[PDB]
Structures are given as structure tokens and as C-alpha cells.
User: Fold 3-oxoacyl-[acyl-carrier-protein] reductase from Acinetobacter baumannii.
Amino acid sequence: MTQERKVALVTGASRGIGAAIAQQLIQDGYFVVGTATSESGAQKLTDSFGEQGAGLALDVRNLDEIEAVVSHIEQNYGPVLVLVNNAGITKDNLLLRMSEDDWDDILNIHLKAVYRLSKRVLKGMTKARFGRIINISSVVAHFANPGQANYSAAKAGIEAFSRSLAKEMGSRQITVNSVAPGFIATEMTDALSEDIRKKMSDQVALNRLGEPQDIANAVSFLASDKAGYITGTVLHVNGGLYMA
Amino acid sequence: RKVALVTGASRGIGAAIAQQLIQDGYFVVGTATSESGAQKLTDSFGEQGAGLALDVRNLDEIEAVVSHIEQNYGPVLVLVNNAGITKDNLLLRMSEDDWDDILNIHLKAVYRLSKRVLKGMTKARFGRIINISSVVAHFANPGQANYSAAKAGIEAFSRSLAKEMGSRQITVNSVAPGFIATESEDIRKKMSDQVALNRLGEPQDIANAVSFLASDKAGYITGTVLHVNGGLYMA
Amino acid sequence: MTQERKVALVTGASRGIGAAIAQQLIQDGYFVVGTATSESGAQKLTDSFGEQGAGLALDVRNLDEIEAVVSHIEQNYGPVLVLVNNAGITKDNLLLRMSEDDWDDILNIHLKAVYRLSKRVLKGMTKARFGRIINISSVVAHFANPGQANYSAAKAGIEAFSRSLAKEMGSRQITVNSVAPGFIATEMTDALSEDIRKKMSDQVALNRLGEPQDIANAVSFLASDKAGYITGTVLHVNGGLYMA
Amino acid sequence: RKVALVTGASRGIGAAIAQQLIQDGYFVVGTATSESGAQKLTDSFGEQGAGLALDVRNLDEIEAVVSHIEQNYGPVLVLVNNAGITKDNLLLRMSEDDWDDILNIHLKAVYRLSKRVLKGMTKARFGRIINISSVVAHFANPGQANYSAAKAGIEAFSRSLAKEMGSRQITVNSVAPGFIATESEDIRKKMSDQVALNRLGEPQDIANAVSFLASDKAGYITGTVLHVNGGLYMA
Ligand SMILES: NC(=O)C1=CN([C@@H]2O[C@H](COP(=O)(O)OP(=O)(O)OC[C@H]3O[C@@H](n4cnc5c(N)ncnc54)[C@H](OP(=O)(O)O)[C@@H]3O)[C@@H](O)[C@H]2O)C=CC1
Ligand SMILES: NC(=O)C1=CN([C@@H]2O[C@H](COP(=O)(O)OP(=O)(O)OC[C@H]3O[C@@H](n4cnc5c(N)ncnc54)[C@H](OP(=O)(O)O)[C@@H]3O)[C@@H](O)[C@H]2O)C=CC1
Ligand SMILES: NC(=O)C1=CN([C@@H]2O[C@H](COP(=O)(O)OP(=O)(O)OC[C@H]3O[C@@H](n4cnc5c(N)ncnc54)[C@H](OP(=O)(O)O)[C@@H]3O)[C@@H](O)[C@H]2O)C=CC1
Ligand SMILES: NC(=O)C1=CN([C@@H]2O[C@H](COP(=O)(O)OP(=O)(O)OC[C@H]3O[C@@H](n4cnc5c(N)ncnc54)[C@H](OP(=O)(O)O)[C@@H]3O)[C@@H](O)[C@H]2O)C=CC1
Assistant:
């Protein structure tokens, strides 16, 4: 077999925003490698992507796994020319109850992972004189939320990292951007009550929660030639929940 | 087709926006300051658009133009405020006329045209207002206090209006171009040296950003500034 | 008589924030000219300031009055070396009901006035190689409020103007800054209900409305030598209502 | 007197902050990475402060130092997180150690020390946490991705904590210095050319900003970044 499409890597593609991003990038014409934290989840991704992608197990907290996954992609499918850092979790707590592990795990899964994966894909993107690094941030990197000091610090750090890397890599036509979702309908919000979803949508100028596909549409735009002169920015997709 | 109105569509950014929105499937009314320019617009757009003369400083012309569009083509459901000029000067040499003309052509025009299209957009429960701003509304440039004030005002206006109209599914956004190629060689290099991507942009880059915002792919984006400056300024 | 103190001009000093600013600048050692829209209001200012200031009538919508007032100050008290643009009103309306006059009056009173007064005091500040221009903005130049498109546009324009002028005048050691108040207790908020003031304070991290003196303290800081390396900024004084 | 804790008070910005807070009426505990540096701090502060050795990378030392202050001087009611270093490199040459050390010394230290002082500030219904950031958290600089990420993270941390602690009248703010004179002549001119005020700043400018934020004159300011950069970067 042959693999002639440009390769996109989407971390945490099992569901919701990550799944929508991965499927959209497939529709756009990429060969998409998506990751999950378990081999079973990776196999589910393989099944969903069919012959235009692949699922791989990855814990983004571990440098050896990051390096092994990117090496596998390079050896089997091609250079990673679109990297979407989407994998994440939250470990919320007011600071007085935020443990060392609460802090470290979130910083490692979000910010350190962005540093490690971006560094690891630079050589191939430089070689191609083409690259897209698209980091999933959050509205709370801008509009502070009590109980999420770790998550907010990590996402804001990601945005500043992205500015630095955009400056370092711009001459090679590699763009580095962040997408900041607002209130997006996921399993989590599905689990909330109707009244609380209404409280949330009342804060949104467009008067509704967003959908994973809205984030996918933003990522797809940034990954395309239609955004070749956009780098070092935050693309806010929050329905007017936060305006800058 | 849905009707888009693009002011100052004669050349450069405006012309690229108008042509892209035609490609996207809109019927595009583009405007120029003269009947001759309007006719050239009509000729380029063919059966997918129309050219009209409009000085955006004049409220009567704004109302006549929008009424004409409503009577002949349909409600204005995409409004792109692109028309503009500069009258640069250090503040000590910036006259009342230099200030007022820039504020009127940019900010007042945005107020007047947005107000005039609200009714049709409200009826349709669909709308795109896309205002052309500038990097200098963020990264200040000596000699452009009037232009900078007007564009920043446009961005704040857009946030307020986005809040007012969001429930009706009308989005209001700004696109802020950086250094875009218009026409000065060693100086060009100075400009490109400030850009992370190490080159000047093209009108089509701005057209692509506007096309994105005007489409269903941006239906959950409102009240934002989309910077298209190659890393010249990073927010 | 003699007038040896540096001269500060505070527009709209009759009450609230402007009155607190004017009195604080007097306490700091300035000779303070404050303005009101009527001769009676100007006389009240003269009475409050005593022999360390003066009250003058000024409608900031009129260039001839601006030029006459600054000329009077220069001829009677000294060059305006601290300018605080505080005068203002609101004319709120959703855009569909916002008239041409609603728009124009607000833009003229806020933004055009800042342009005119700043331009008029530049020569004296340049001559002194010292200057402070301090523009009163608003949190709504950042956090959008429906019904205030004119006021928001004007204050945001003022902030951008201030950046431009800061760049133009920095070599002469003239600083140009804005102070953005949040919810400050004034006659207007006094006229609101207790329940609505509680609704407001609930949005504020510090859980209370501010006081005019908080704004005065910010202006006093920026006008002093303790802020000689601060220019082109917005100093937010809103108790955490809006964080940037 | 109320007790202020200033990390990295040996020289420059930290030393200026510590001396200014002494002048303001605080009892200042300043820290250094060695017992000798701590002794020099003790000597300079005299009867208005004390010097202690502290590596902010080590949680045990943080807890021992704050406990010692509580047992000997009083609750820490002003915390200034100033200690830091740089380990610059383009990302392709930035090692895991270069990244981790900077993140730990800046951001992790801010998390740990802020957490450790919350109880005393909550009891007093008074507190000032003032974190030293940098212009490069806003205006990116090649080679400083780690430093930039850490300082931006500190600013977002500060906003979150300001929301958590505001009801108790504890403010949490950042001060972002620009180009501040430390120690390279024609290059100095390049730096000053980027500054609207056309000169490098001094440590005392940063001390003045911190002194303002730590005082009653800033009791309604929380969750902000106070830029002190002479117009190098305008927000
Ligand atoms: N959800 C929302 O409403 C919002 C989300 N965001 C951000 O967008 C992204 C999407 O969030 P969400 O849609 O909630 O994604 P989900 O929480 O729905 O699923 C998260 C994904 O991350 C993966 N993941 C979790 N921990 C690790 C790890 N240690 N190593 C590798 N992969 C891991 C999971 O793998 P597995 O499937 O095996 O668990 C899963 O694929 C996140 O970065 C989040 O911060 C921002 C704003 C709003
Ligand atoms: N060009 C650039 O590099 C950058 C431009 N921008 C902004 O992008 C937009 C496009 O810039 P640019 O392409 O230079 O366009 P201009 O600002 O030069 O605008 C020219 C167009 O506007 C029309 N126009 C001028 N005055 C009026 C008026 N009073 N009423 C109606 N139409 C008027 C002209 O009509 P006619 O053809 O008849 O003269 C022409 O179609 C502007 O808002 C500009 O400020 C932002 C940053 C960079
Ligand atoms: N009040 C608040 O809570 C907030 C206020 N601000 C801003 O801070 C400033 C203070 O607002 P506020 O405290 O309400 O001041 P007030 O509304 O209490 O009084 C306003 C002052 O402005 C003067 N004024 C009004 N129109 C004119 C005019 N055309 N020419 C000259 N002077 C005029 C009045 O003069 P006279 O006394 O003769 O009427 C009065 O002195 C304003 O710029 C406002 O936008 C921002 C955020 C919150
Ligand atoms: N200096 C400048 O131009 C600018 C600096 N900044 C920031 O302002 C702050 C001050 O900068 P600068 O004056 O250069 O200070 P540094 O970043 O050089 O910090 C030096 C001080 O921190 C101490 N320190 C270093 N490592 C540790 C550690 N692991 N644990 C505890 N203390 C430590 C040093 O102790 P010892 O004396 O024992 O070595 C010394 O007191 C920093 O956060 C800096 O990043 C921001 C922008 C501009």
C-alpha cells in the first residue's frame, strides 16, 4: 500500500471535539492519526477512520510514548504536517484544596504535552516548508474561572508558547495558532441539567451552546490554505460568551 | 441568492472580498464613489452582482442604496464595511478635517450601515456583519491616531452589537489586516522583517478570512477580531 | 499673586469620580483647574478648591471653548502639565433606537474632546519635557454592554488614540494612559436599588462596588513620578469585574 | 508591622521591591538561594526585615520558610513572587531540563507559595499577592518559549486566584516589566529604540508599581497585569 495524503495527528480523538476535528480533517483530504489513552479506544478510532486514518494509544504525559507515536507515524504514514493538540482532562479544585498532583498532572497533560509534541514535529514541518500546529485552548485562559487555576495556567501558557513558536518558525511557513472553545455541548454538558444548560446559554450572545463541529470548522479553517497568513493568534469560538 | 453588500469593492481587499463572496454563492452588491466605478463593478460581477455609487459619509445615500438593494435584489444579509481612506499626521499637525473625515468614513459609516440592515437580518434570523479593522487598532503607529481610534471604535461597536443581535443568530465580527501588498523595495523588506511569516499578505488572505466568517463554518463566532497579519501582531 | 505649582486640568470635576480626582491632585500638590458645564457649577468648584485651584465653565463639545479655557489657564495659572479627560455623559439605546444625535453627541463629548484637549496641551508639555495625559475610559470598552455601542466605541477609540499619542510623545517624557473604572458608587448607583447594587457587587471579585477615591488613587499614581515608566496602558480599576 | 515576603531579593528588581516595601512600613522577609545571600539581606534590612535561604523549587523549603516567618514575625500578608532565571533556546534546542526548571522556578513556585499563604490572608481578610511577570508573556520573543509560557501561566493563575479570594479582600495581581537596566552599548540602543519613552527602565520603576499594588491605594485592583515597559508594549 501507499500513503500519499498529508498526515494530521489529532490527540484525544475518541469523542466530542476531538472526534469532530479528526473526521473533519479526513473530509478535508488528510490522512488522520487520532489517539486515545487505551488500545481499545485506539482500535475504535481505527474502525471509525477506516482506510483514511489510524488509531494509536498515547498517554501524552510520557515523552517516550510521544516519541514512539510520532516515529510510528513517520515510518508508516508520513510526516506529521498538521498537529492538533486536543487531548486533556480537568482536575478542578479551589487552590486551598488543589494538590501537587492536581497541578502537575494538568500542566503535564496540557502544556508540557504541547511543548513535547510541537518540538517533535518541527523537523518534518521544517523539511516540508509547511506546517500547522493548532492547539485547543479554552475561554477560561481569558475569562477566569474559580477552581481552574491549573487548567487556566496551562492553556494560557500554551497560547504564549504558540506565540513564541510562531515567531521562531514563521520564516519556514509553519503557522502556530490556538482555538479557544466556549460552552460546547459534550457528554459533560449532556450530563448537566436542562436548567443549567439554560443558565449557560443565557451567558452566550448567540443564546445556545456550541457543538463539536463548530470547533472542527475552526480547526479545519486554520489548517487550510485559507488561513496561510494567520499565525500566533487565538481563534475564539464561544458564541460571544467572551469577546476580544 | 442571499445578498451581500461590500463597500469600497473597486480594488484590492474589497474587490477580492466581493469576488470571493460571489464564488461562495452570494449575490454581491459592491459600491464605489463614482458611477464609473460602479459600472466597472457591474461589469466584473456580471449576473452574480451589481455595482452602485455610494459615498458612505452621506446618510441619505446610505439609505437610498440599501432601499434600492431591498427593492431590486433582496434583504442585505451580509454587510462588509470595507470602504476607507487614511489622512495620516502627527497629532500636532492633524487637523479637525483630518480627524473628522476618517472617523466619518470608517466608524460613522459602520454605525449607519449596520443600523440600516438590522431590520432585514432580524426578520431572517440570519446575519453577518463583518467590519474591516486594522492591526494598528492594536499595535499603534505614529501619525495614525485618527485611523487607529476609528478602527478600535469599530471593534468595540461590533462587540456591543454582537451582544444586542446574537439571539437572532446575527454575528458581528471584525477582520484586522496587517501589512497587505498594494504597491518601496528596501522599505518593503523593513515591513516584511516585522512579520513572522516574513512576507506581506495579499488581498485574497483577507477575502478568505471574510469568506470564513460569512459562512456556516463560523456560525458560533461573534464579537471577535480575526487577525490576518502573518504574526506581525499576536493577540 | 504667584502660581508656582504644576497645573492639572480635570474636566467634569463637579461630583463623583471627577471631584475625587481633582481633590486628590490638590492633595498631591498640584494647582487644579476643574471644569463644569455651567458658570454656577464652575463657581462651586472654585469654592471647593479655594486658593489651590479654580473652576471654569466648559462644554467639551465646542472647540472654541476648549481653546479659550486652556488659553485662560496658561495666562492665569500656568501650562497644563496634567490633563485628566473625565467629562462625559451616556445616551444609551439599542442600535435600532440609537439616533444620529445619540451617536454624535457621545462621540464628540468623549473621543473628539480627548483629541482636541490633548492636541491643545501638547505644546506646553513638550516645552516642559514632562506631561501626563490620563483619560477616563470604562470597563465597557472591553466587556461589551448592549445599548452602549456609542459609549463603548468612544472609550475604545480613546484607548487607541492614547496608544498612538504615547508613541508620538514618549521621547519627550510625556506619558499617555487610560484608567478604566468598573462599578463605582456614584449618584447613579445610589439611585439604584439595594437588590440591584447586590446584583452588581456579585459580579465583582472583591464583592463590592468601588468608590470615586479608588479612581482618584489610580489617577494620582499615574500622574506621579512613581509611574514615569508607564505609558500607553489601561489601568483597570474594577475589583475583578473584568480581568486582563 | 505587616509581614511581606519577597523572593529573590538579592539584587536588582527584587532588592528594590524589598527596600521600597520597608519604606512603605512593611516588615520585609527577603530570600536568597544561599545562607550568605540571606545574611547580606539581613544586614541590609536591619531591624525592618530579615533574610532567609530558600530554593523555591523545593516544597519542603517553602513550607519551612513560611512556617518560620509565621512563628517569628507574623502572617505573610504581602507575597511578592520575584525569584527567577532564564534558560533560553530555540525550541529545537530547548531541553526537557531547560523547560522544566523555568516552569518550576516561576509558575510552580507561584502556585506553591500562594497556596501556602492563603490561610493567613483569609484569617486577616487582607492580602496582596503580587507576581512578577514579563512583557514577553504578551510580546513573544524567539528563544524564550519556556519563560513566556511560565509568565503567561502566572498571569492566568492570578486571575483564577483573584476570583477565588476576592470576597476576603485579598488582591492578586501581576507586574510585567519591560526592558529594565541590569548590565552592550549599540545593542542597548536597539532595545531603547523599541521603547516609546526611549530609555531602559530601572528596578525602582518596578518597585514603585509593586508598592502601589501592595498599598491601600490599589484596594479595588485585582486580577490585572500592570505593564511597566515605557511603551515597549501597549495593551
Ligand atoms: N469540552 C468542552 O466543553 C471544552 C473543552 N475544551 C478543550 O478542548 C479539548 C476537548 O475537551 P473534551 O471535548 O472534553 O475532550 P474529552 O474530555 O471529551 O475526551 C478527552 C480526550 O482526551 C484524551 N486524554 C485524556 N487524558 C489523556 C492523556 N493523559 N493522554 C492522552 N490522551 C488523553 C481522552 O482519551 P480517552 O478517550 O482514552 O479517555 C479523550 O480522547 C480539551 O483540550 C479541553 O480542554 C475547552 C473548552 C470547552
Ligand atoms: N490596504 C492595506 O494594506 C490595509 C488596509 N486596511 C483596511 O482595509 C480596507 C481596504 O483597504 P484599501 O484596500 O486600502 O481600501 P481604501 O481604504 O483605499 O478604500 C478604497 C475603497 O473605498 C472607497 N471609498 C473611499 N472613500 C469612500 C467614501 N467616502 N465612500 C465610499 N467609498 C469610499 C473607494 O472608492 P473608489 O474606488 O471610488 O475610490 C474604494 O473602493 C480599509 O478599511 C483599509 O482601511 C487595513 C490594513 C491594511
Ligand atoms: N460613573 C461610573 O460609575 C463610571 C464612570 N465612568 C467614566 O468616568 C467619568 C466619570 O463619570 P461620572 O462619575 O458619571 O461623572 P458624572 O456623570 O458624575 O458628572 C459628569 C461630569 O461631566 C461633566 N459634563 C457632562 N457633559 C459635559 C460636556 N458636554 N462638557 C463638559 N463637561 C460635561 C458634568 O458637568 P456638570 O457637573 O455641569 O453636569 C459633570 O461634571 C466619565 O467619563 C464616565 O464615562 C466609567 C465607568 C464607570
Ligand atoms: N531583569 C529584567 O530585566 C527583567 C526581569 N523580569 C523578571 O523580574 C524578576 C527579577 O528579574 P531579575 O532581577 O533578573 O531576577 P532573576 O530572575 O535573576 O532572579 C534572581 C534572584 O532570584 C533568586 N533565585 C534564582 N533562582 C532561584 C531559586 N531556584 N530559588 C530561589 N531564588 C532563586 C536569586 O538568588 P541568588 O541571589 O542567591 O542567586 C536572586 O535573588 C524575575 O521574575 C525576572 O524573570 C522581567 C522582565 C525584565
